[PDB]
Design a protein around this ligand. Structure first.
Ligand SMILES: NC(=O)C1=CN([C@@H]2O[C@H](COP(=O)(O)OP(=O)(O)OC[C@H]3O[C@@H](n4cnc5c(N)ncnc54)[C@H](OP(=O)(O)O)[C@@H]3O)[C@@H](O)[C@H]2O)C=CC1
Ligand SMILES: [Cl-]
Length: 315
């Protein structure tokens, strides 16, 4: 059938300003890391994107190597965009990235100007776009001068292939250097995409304070620790360790006292200090997107609740 976005999509969703910029992101964003490749059904991928936009999720996050196979999430997103979302493309924030392994050899990974420009050209072709809203350097490249990588980002914005740029997985010291280089170049860093959840709190050691200084936004990836902070395990160590399973059980009892699912409490917790712009979820079914949006109704934490959480995590 012909897709018609829900007319009340902007009524419930909360939009949050992304650092000091003109961009407001939905409090909940959707990532295409899993369930958008050739190994899942396009019927399901389409249903996820339509349910997300109907609930006011305007930001879809991709990367060149998302699938599997690499590049298939960008192709499938490109097809669904052409078929169902073209009249509303200017209502969407689409992102992509380059920095991890995409193709074989010395120019298909890392941070060279060659890789970033060739990869974004590939990404725009797979997605059928003139530009992405945000282009990221996917991870640090310690062996390439940071200035070359940042100058490639500045070039792609000046020559209209990206509206804004970002960095992902950069530690606080490297994030400072990257932000200052981009500011001097005249293309200020819009955003940082770090891993952040109850089980991964490294950004609280300086990065969030630095981004707030510098007026740079942030979007937490793996906010459910890849699905550990859910109902899923309520087992191989890769799935969950014994100590983490005991923490999940105790965190779920606290979520129950609050009248919400563990997943909802875990997402709410990431935004508790109003110093993270958005939470980037993964989803295999539309009910998981509905669950995430349902977190907005119950995302306040008291001093006592934060102490309760820290005590569970200390065990
Ligand atoms: N910059 C970077 O280096 C990286 C970026 N990313 C980005 O961040 C996004 C988030 O990563 P991801 O770790 O997937 O996201 P989450 O941590 O939100 O976990 C998502 C997965 O957990 C399960 N899940 C989600 N909600 C629920 C729920 N309510 N009940 C039960 N299970 C649930 C689903 O798995 P199932 O199949 O079991 O239902 C889903 O695929 C990615 O989509 C991607 O765009 C991710 C990794 C690397
Ligand atoms: Cl476009």
């Amino acid at each position: 059938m012909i897709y018609q976005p829900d007319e009340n999509r902007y009524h419930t969703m909360e939009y949050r300003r992304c650092g000091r910029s003109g961009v407001k992101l939905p409090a909940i964003s959707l990532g295409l890391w899993h369930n958008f490749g050739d190994t899942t059904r396009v019927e399901n991928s389409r249903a996820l994107l339509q349910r997300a936009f109907d609930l006011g999720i305007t930001h879809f996050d991709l990367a060149n190597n998302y699938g599997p196979p690499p590049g298939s999430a960008e192709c499938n997103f490109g097809r669904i965009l052409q078929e169902d979302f073209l009249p509303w493309r200017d209502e969407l924030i689409i992102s992509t990235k380059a920095g991890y392994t995409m193709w074989d050899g010395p120019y298909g990974d890392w941070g060279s100007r060659k890789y970033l420009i060739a990869s974004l050209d590939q990404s725009l072709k797979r997605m059928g776009l003139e530009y992405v809203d945000i282009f990221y350097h996917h991870r640090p490249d310690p062996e390439t001068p940071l200035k070359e990588t940042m100058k490639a980002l500045d070039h792609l914005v000046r020559h209209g292939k990206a509206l804004y740029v970002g960095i992902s997985n950069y530690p606080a010291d490297l994030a400072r250097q990257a932000i200052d280089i981009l500011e001097d170049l005249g293309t200020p860093c819009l955003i940082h995409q770090p891993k952040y959840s109850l089980f991964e709190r490294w950004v609280e050691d300086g990065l969030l304070a630095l981004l707030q200084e510098k007026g740079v936004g942030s979007i937490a990836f793996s906010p459910l620790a890849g699905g550990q902070l859910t109902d899923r395990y309520l087992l191989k160590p890769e799935q969950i360790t014994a100590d983490k399973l005991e923490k999940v059980r105790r965190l779920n009892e606290l979520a129950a006292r609050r009248g919400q699912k563990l997943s909802q409490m875990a997402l709410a917790w990431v935004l508790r200090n109003d110093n993270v712009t958005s939470v980037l979820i993964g989803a295999s079914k539309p009910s998981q997107i509905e669950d995430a949006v349902g977190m907005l109704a119950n995302r306040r934490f008291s001093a006592a609740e934060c102490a309760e959480i820290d005590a569970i995590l200390e065990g």
